[PDB]
Subunit: 399 residues, 4 copies
C-alpha cells in the first residue's frame, strides 16, 4: 500500500519540517528516504518491476507527501511525470529498457525540459545533430526540476542550426552523470526552498541516437494533433494542483492542532475556550468547505485522466480538451483554496503562532511560490472559453 508508506515517511519528515524549510538547500536525507521506500517506481508498470499504480493512487501519494512537505511533494510529483514521457513519445524498446532501469535501480528522474515562456529559437539549450544520428547539447537550462540529485535526466534541446531540422524540439533521457552535464546548486526562493529548481549547464553533452525520445519535434507534433503526448500538460497540471491541496491540508491540520493545544481564547470577548469561539469555528468551517469542493473536483479529474490514459492512442482531441478544461478548473480551485487557507489559518492561530519555531508561514510561502509557475488567470480564461464558446485549450506544456 503506497499511500501507507507515504504516511510513514510523512511522520518521519514532520519532526524536521521547520528546520529544513529554514535551512533550504537540498533535502538529501529525505530524498534517500524516498528512494529507500521504493516509491520512485510507483507509476512504472509491475511487469518492469514497478508498482503499476493508477493515477488516482499516485496522486494520493503525492498529496500525502505534499502535506508533510511542499518541496518534497513537488520533487516527487514532478519525478512521477517524467517517465510517462517515455510511454508518450518514446519507442516500445526505450520503454522496456528505461522503465526497467528506473524500477530496478530506484532512480530519481529529473527535468531540464520545457522553457514554457520562450519561443523555441530563443531556448537556451541547443541540440546540434551528429552524423551518428545523436545530438550534442549546449547552454544553460535556467529553470529545472530535480536535476540536481537525479540519476536519469529528461532534457529538451532545440535545433538552432540552420539544419533542415531547425526549430525542432529534441527530447532525450540521458544519465545526469554524463560528462558536460552540471546541475548547479543554484536554487533560491521564498518558498519551495528544497525543490532543487536551479539551473543546469550543458557542455558538449552527447545524446546517443537511442537516447532520443521519438522523432525530432515529436512533442510539438503530438500537441498539434492532440495525440497521446498531449497528455503531458493535463498530467503535470493535475499533479501541481494536488501538491497545493496537500499543502492546504498540511496548513489546516497544523492550525487545528495548534488551536486545540496552544491557542488562547479572546477573554475581552468573554470567550473561555478557543475551540468554542464562534468565529474560530466559522473560519475552520470555511477552510474545510473550500477544500471539500476543491478535493472532490481533483478526484473527479483524476478518474477522468485515468479514463483518457486507458484509451491509449484512440483518444480524441475532444477527450484531451475536455480533460484539460477539467484540470484547468482544479488548478484554479486548488490555487485559490491553498492560498486562502495558508494565509487565513493565522487568524485562528493567534500572535504566538508567528514564532519562527512553528514555521507556520511555510505552507503559504510554498503555495505562493509554485502557484506562479504558470498564470492561474489563463487557467480560468481557458475554462471560460470552453464554457462560453466550446473552445479547447491550445495544447502546449502548460495547457
Amino acid at each position: 500500500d503506497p499511500v501507507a508508506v507515504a504516511r510513514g515517511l510523512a511522520e518521519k519528515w514532520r519532526a524536521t519540517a521547520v528546520e529544513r524549510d529554514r535551512a533550504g538547500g537540498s533535502a538529501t536525507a529525505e530524498r534517500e528516504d524516498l528512494r529507500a521506500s521504493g516509491l520512485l517506481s510507483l507509476l512504472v508498470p509491475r511487469e518492469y518491476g514497478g508498482w503499476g499504480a493508477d493515477w488516482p493512487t499516485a496522486i494520493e501519494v503525492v498529496r500525502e507527501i505534499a502535506a508533510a512537505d511542499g518541496s518534497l511533494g513537488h520533487l516527487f510529483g514532478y519525478h512521477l511525470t517524467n517517465a510517462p514521457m517515455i510511454e508518450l513519445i518514446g519507442s516500445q524498446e526505450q520503454e522496456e529498457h528505461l522503465y526497467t532501469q528506473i524500477a530496478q535501480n530506484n532512480w530519481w528522474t529529473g527535468n531540464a525540459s520545457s522553457e514554457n515562456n520562450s519561443h523555441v529559437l530563443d531556448w537556451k539549450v541547443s541540440a546540434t545533430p551528429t552524423e551518428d544520428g545523436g545530438y550534442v547539447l549546449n547552454g544553460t537550462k535556467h529553470f529545472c526540476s530535480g536535476a540536481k540529485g537525479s540519476d536519469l535526466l529528461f532534457v529538451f534541446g532545440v535545433v538552432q542550426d540552420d539544419s533542415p531540422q531547425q526549430g525542432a524540439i529534441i527530447a532525450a533521457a540521458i544519465p545526469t552523470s554524463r560528462a558536460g552535464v552540471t546541475p548547479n546548486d543554484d536554487w533560491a526562493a521564498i518558498g519551495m526552498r528544497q525543490t532543487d529548481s536551479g539551473s543546469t549547464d550543458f557542455h558538449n553533452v552527447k545524446v546517443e541516437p537511442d537516447e532520443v525520445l521519438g522523432a525530432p519535434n515529436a512533442f510539438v507534433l503530438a500537441f498539434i494533433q492532440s495525440e497521446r503526448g498531449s497528455l503531458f500538460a493535463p498530467i503535470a497540471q493535475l499533479i501541481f494542483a494536488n501538491v497545493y491541496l496537500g499543502i492546504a491540508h498540511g496548513a489546516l491540520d497544523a492550525a487545528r492542532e495548534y488551536t486545540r493545544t496552544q491557542a488562547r481564547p479572546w477573554t475581552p470577548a468573554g470567550i473561555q475556550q478557543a475551540t468554542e469561539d464562534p468565529y474560530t469555528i466559522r473560519s475552520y468551517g470555511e477552510f474545510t468547505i473550500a477544500l471539500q469542493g476543491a478535493d472532490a473536483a481533483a478526484r473527479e479529474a483524476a478518474h477522468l485522466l485515468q479514463t483518457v490514459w486507458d484509451k491509449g492512442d484512440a483518444l480524441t482531441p475532444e477527450d484531451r480538451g475536455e480533460l484539460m478544461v477539467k484540470v484547468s478548473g482544479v488548478k484554479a480551485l486548488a490555487t485559490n483554496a491553498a492560498l486562502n487557507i495558508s494565509s487565513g489559518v493565522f487568524e485562528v492561530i493567534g500572535a504566538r503562532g508567528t514564532h519562527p519555531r512553528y514555521g507556520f508561514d511555510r505552507f503559504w510561502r510554498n503555495v505562493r511560490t509554485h502557484s506562479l509557475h504558470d498564470p492561474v488567470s489563463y487557467k480560468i480564461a481557458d475554462v471560460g472559453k470552453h464554457t462560453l464558446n466550446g473552445q479547447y485549450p491550445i495544447p502546449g506544456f502548460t495547457s
Copy 2:
C-alpha cells in the same frame, strides 16, 4: 432512464418557465406532466411497482428538473423525501401497503411535518389520542411543502395533552382528501413561487391506528440514538443543495445562450465580439469553476448517503454524523455558488437582459428564497465544530 425522462419534461417546461414564474400560483399542468411521467415513484423499490432508483440517480433527476424550474425541482425533491420516512420509522406492513399505493396510483406525496424552529409544546398542530389507538389532529401547519395538490399527506402532531404521551411527536401518513384537512392556496414569496408552501388547517382530522408511523415520538427517539430515522436531515438537506445547484446550472446555461446570441460587445473598449471579451470569458470561467467544485462535492456526498443507506439498521452514530458533516459542506458550497452565479450572470448578460420577458432574475429569486429555509451559517459552524473539535451535529430536522 429516469434522467432522460426529466430532460424531456425540462424541455417542455422551458417554454413556459418565465410566464409561470410571473403568474405564481400552483403549477397544475406541470405537476400532471410529472405524474404522467411515472417519476413520482422513482425511489419506490421495483418490487412495489417503483423504479427502485439509487440516491445518486434520484438526485440527478432532481437536478434536471431544478435547472428548468426551481419550484418544480423543490416540489419533486421534497416529495421524494416523504415516502422514505415510511421505511425509516414505519412498520414493514405500512411499508408494503404505502409504497404500493404510491407507485400504483402515481401519488403526489405532501408534507405538513416539522416545525424546525419551534419547541414541540408550541407546535400549532395537536395530536389528541383516541381510544381506538389513533389520534385527532387540530390546528394550522403554517409552513408546508406540497400539501396542496397531494394525495398522501405526511403530518406531525404533538400530544399537547397532559397525556402520559405529552410532547411526543406523532407521525402519520393520511389521505389529503380526508375530512378536516384544508391545504390553503396561501403561498406568497419573491421566489419558489410555485412550490405550494402555504398553510394547511386541520380540523378534528382522524388518524387511524395503522396510519400512525412508528411509536409515539419515534422520530425524536431515532435522532437521539442516531438510528436509521436520523437519515432524514442528511437526505432533505442534500436534496436542497442539489436543487440550488440545478438552479445555478439553469442560470448559467441561460446566460451563456444569451451571451452567444443577444449580448453586445462593449465597443468603447474596442471589443468586437461579446464572446471574446476577456472579462466576460474570465467570469464564465469563475462560474464554471465554482460549480465544478460544488457539484463534485455533492456527488461524493450522494455516494456516501447511498453507502450509509445500504447499511440499514447497522449504521453507527459516526456514519450518520460524518454523512451530515459532508452534507452540511455541500449545502454551504451550493448556497454560495448558486447565489453568486445567479446574480453574477447579469454582468455578462448586459442591460437588455433585464427585460421581464427573459425572467433572468428568477434563478436568483428562487435560490435566494429557499436558501433561507435553515441558516447556512450553522451548516458552516457544524462543519467547523467537526474539523476543529471532532463534534457531530445534534440530529434534528435540519441537522
Copy 3:
C-alpha cells in the same frame, strides 16, 4: 437645507415603496412631490432662481432619495446631470435663459441623448439641417431617461446626411411637448421599474437655431480635447455610483429594522435573541464596513469633482483624467458593495422576509438592473491602466 427636504420626501415615499415597485409604471405623484419641493433647481445657480448647491450637497440629496427609492434616485440624479450640459457646451445666453426657465417653472428635465454603444452613423435619431440654421429630428431613441414626464428634453441627433456636417452630433434642449415628440410608456425591467426609461419617437421635430447647444459635434470636440464638456461622464458616473450606495443603505436599514423587530433566533443553535447571534452580528459588521469604505471614496471623489468643476475652462486633461479614474473606482466600489449587501441582507432577515409584502428584493433588483448601464469590468480596467501604465480613460459618454 435641501438634504432635510429630501429626508422629508423619503419619509413620505416609504409608505408606498413596496406597492409602487410592484405596480411599476410612472411614479407620477412622487415626481410631483419632487417638483413641489423645489429640488429640481438644486444645481441651478442662485442668481437664476436655483439653490446653487455644490456637488457634494447635490449628491447627498440624490443619496437620500435613492435610499427611499432607487427609481426616483435615478430619475432625479439623471435630471441633475442635464442642465450642467448647458453650462458645458451651451452659450452664455442659452445658459441664462434655460437655467431661469427651469428654476422659475420647476421643470423636470429629461434625456434622449447618448447611444453609448453605437457608432454615430448608426444612431437611430437623425438631425437634418434646415436653412434657417436649425434641424429636424427623425427616428426613435430607444433608451431614454425620464423623457416621459419631462418639460425640457435634451436630445442628440446625428447629421446622417452627406451634409458637410455628416457624423456631427447635434445637441439640443427642446420642450418635450413640441409636436412630433412622443415619449412612449415603453419601459419594462426587473428593477428601476419607475425610471421611465422607454423609447421616444421623433417625427419631423423642429429644433430652432437657438435651441442648438454649441457648434455641431461640440460634445465630441470637448472629449477629444478634455475641455469642460468632458466633465459629463465623471458627473453622470459619480451620480450613478451614489444611487447604488443610497440603495445599499436603504437595504441595510430595512434589514436591520426587520432583524430587530421581526427576525427570530435560530433556536437549534441555542440562540435566544436574533440581535445576539454572532454570525448575524458579523454579517452586519461586513455590510457596514463595505459601505464605510465605498462611501468615504465617493465623498472624496465628490470633493475632487468640485475642485475640477471650479477650475472652469482652465482644467487640464490630467485634471479630468485623474477625476475620471477616481470616479471609476467609486463606480466599482459602489456596484460591488450594493450588489453584495442587497443580496446578503436576506441571510440576516430569514425565510419570512421573503414575503412580497416586504418587497425586500427590490433593492437588489434596482441595483442589479442599473449596474448594467455600462460594464463595471471596464471601470476596473480603466483604474488598472492608470495605476500600471499612467493611462487615462478615453473621454466619452461613460468614461
Copy 4:
C-alpha cells in the same frame, strides 16, 4: 514638512530593506536616522520644543515609513502613541516636564504596558507600593513594543498585593536605563522582524511618586467613564490600520515597478507586453480600488480623531464610541486589503519575483504578523453591534 523628511528617510532605507528583513535583529542604524530626523517629537506640542503636528499629519508620516519598512512604521507609530498617554492620564506638571525631555533629548519612547488578553490579577508585572508613595515593579512583561532601544519606558504594573489598592493598574514613565529593567533581545517572528517586540524583565525596579501617571487604576477609571484616557485604543488601532495601509502601498508600488521593468508577458496567450495583459491590468485595478476605499476611510477616521481630541475633557461617551466604531471599520478594511494585496501582488510579478533578493514576501509577512495583535473578527463584530443594536464597544486597550 515632516512628511517630506519621512520620504527622505524612506529613500535611504529602501536600499537596505531586503537585507534588514532577512537579518532581523534591531534596526539600530535606522532608529538613529529617525532620532536624527527630529521626527520622534512629531506629536509633542511646539511649546515644549516638538512639532505640534495634528493626527492626520502624524498618520501620513507613519504611512510613509510603513511603506518603506513595516517594522519601522510599527516602531515609530507605537512610539507616537506613548507620550499622549501623559496628556491623557498624567498631571499638567508631568506633561510639561516629560514632553520637554522627549523633545529636547530626541528620546525614543518604549512600551511595556498592557497585557491585552490577561486578567489584571494574572498580569506578570506586579507593582508593590512603597511608603514614599512610589512602587517597585517585579516580573517579566512578555510582549513589549520598542522597549529595547528606548530612553523613556511606559510601564504598567498591577498591585497584586492584598493592598487596599489590589487589582489597580499602575502606569509609570521611567528611564529604560533604571536599574532592574532588562529589555531582552528576545523577539522572533516571521514578520515585523525589527520591531523589538520581545520581553522585558523587571527586578525591584523603583518607580518614584512623580513617575506614576495619574491615580492608581486611572486607566481603568478613564475607560469605564469614557473620559479622555479612553482615547487610547482608538489612537493605537488607527496607527496600526495605517501601518497596514502603508505596507499595502509599499507592496503595490514594488509590484508595479517590477511589472514594468522585469515581468515577462505570457507568450502562449499571445501577449507581447506584460503591462498590456488584460488580467494583469484588472488585478492592478482591484488592488488600487481596495486601497482607495480603505485609505479614504482611514483619512475620515483621522479627522474624526482630531475633532474628538480637540474637545479635550468635554468629549462624550458617544463621541468616543462613534470614533472607536469608525476606527474598528478602518482596522478591518486595512487588514483585509493589505493581506489581499500583499499576497495577490505575486500573481502579476511572476515566478522570477520569488527570488529572495527581491524580498517580495516581506510585505505579506509583515501584515500577516501584526494583523494578529488583536482579532479582526471582533473589530468586525463591534461594527455590527453598533449598526444593528446601537451598542458601543466596551472601552479597553484594544476596543
